[PDB]
Amino acid sequence: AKRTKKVGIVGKYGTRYGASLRKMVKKIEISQHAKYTCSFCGKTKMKRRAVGIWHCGSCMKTVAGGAWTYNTTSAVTVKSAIRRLKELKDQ
Amino acid sequence: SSHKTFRIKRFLAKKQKQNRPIPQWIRMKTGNKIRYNSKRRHWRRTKLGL
């Protein structure tokens, strides 16, 4: 059965810290503890080890990513910028 | 304590050896002017320097 109406994972914090702060930290914590699909072995075992460090249980590949997500949108845009500047640099 | 260094043990040895009464034959010496060992030390009354 559904146990909480809206707090979800931030129900452990009780009534403390304010509704807006709990709402703000809720999405960061859900993304933090989520398991991502590994892009090397294809399994859903990529989980955060420390801040900025993501490790896969199966193939034991460690990737440097974001603090709370596996990759940040900023870094994805950077990778696209670097590939386009690389292909523009050479011919 | 039970754990002690050799210097501490030697110091305590000397402090034991000199904490004894005067010999009886001292008082019959000529011009003695000594009645008793005034430097006697008890382990509970006064503590050692270390």
């Binding site: 702060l21 801040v51 974001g66 709370w68 950077v78 990778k79 | -």
Partner: protein, 149 residues
């Protein structure tokens, strides 16, 4: 401990004697274990590579920039930060870069830097929410946290 950016342990080959040299590069985000990273002038534009600023294009952004031509990385080291290469002039061998503070700096074209943004992402978005979390954060840095007005 004490920093939010992960550190990358990279092993090179010593070019002059039979030995393995282990470095402690600052991990640009996107690199992984078992990846080959190439350091030098003729290195290519890939995330994690180290190459001088003078040979990179006019819009690339970097990770661990050198303030002087020859020291190790000094700029854009904190997690999530980067510096942007703006302009070059082959004469006088200068390069204009945009620091994370937004200031513009002219540096030598020989300064090396890591391609990409440093790992650690958006660490400052999460509210600390607790005096204890701040206590543990600053326990690993220095004695500065409980601040009396």
């Amino acid at each position: 401990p004490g920093r939010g950016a992960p550190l990358a342990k990279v092993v090179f080959r010593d070019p002059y004697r039979f030995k393995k040299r282990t470095e402690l590069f600052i991990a640009a985000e996107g690199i992984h274990t078992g990846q080959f990273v190439y350091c030098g002038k003729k290195a290519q534009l890939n995330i994690g590579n180290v190459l001088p600023v003078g040979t990179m294009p006019e819009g690339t952004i970097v990770c661990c920039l050198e303030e002087k031509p020859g020291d190790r990385g000094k700029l854009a080291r904190a997690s999530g930060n980067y510096a942007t290469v703006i302009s070059h002039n082959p004469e006088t061998k200068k390069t204009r870069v945009k620091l994370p503070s937004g200031s513009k700096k002219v540096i030598s074209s020989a300064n090396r830097a890591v391609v990409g943004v440093v790992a650690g992402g958006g660490r400052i978005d999460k509210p600390i929410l607790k005096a204890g979390r701040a206590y543990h954060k600053y326990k690993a840095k220095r004695n500065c946290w409980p601040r009396v007005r």
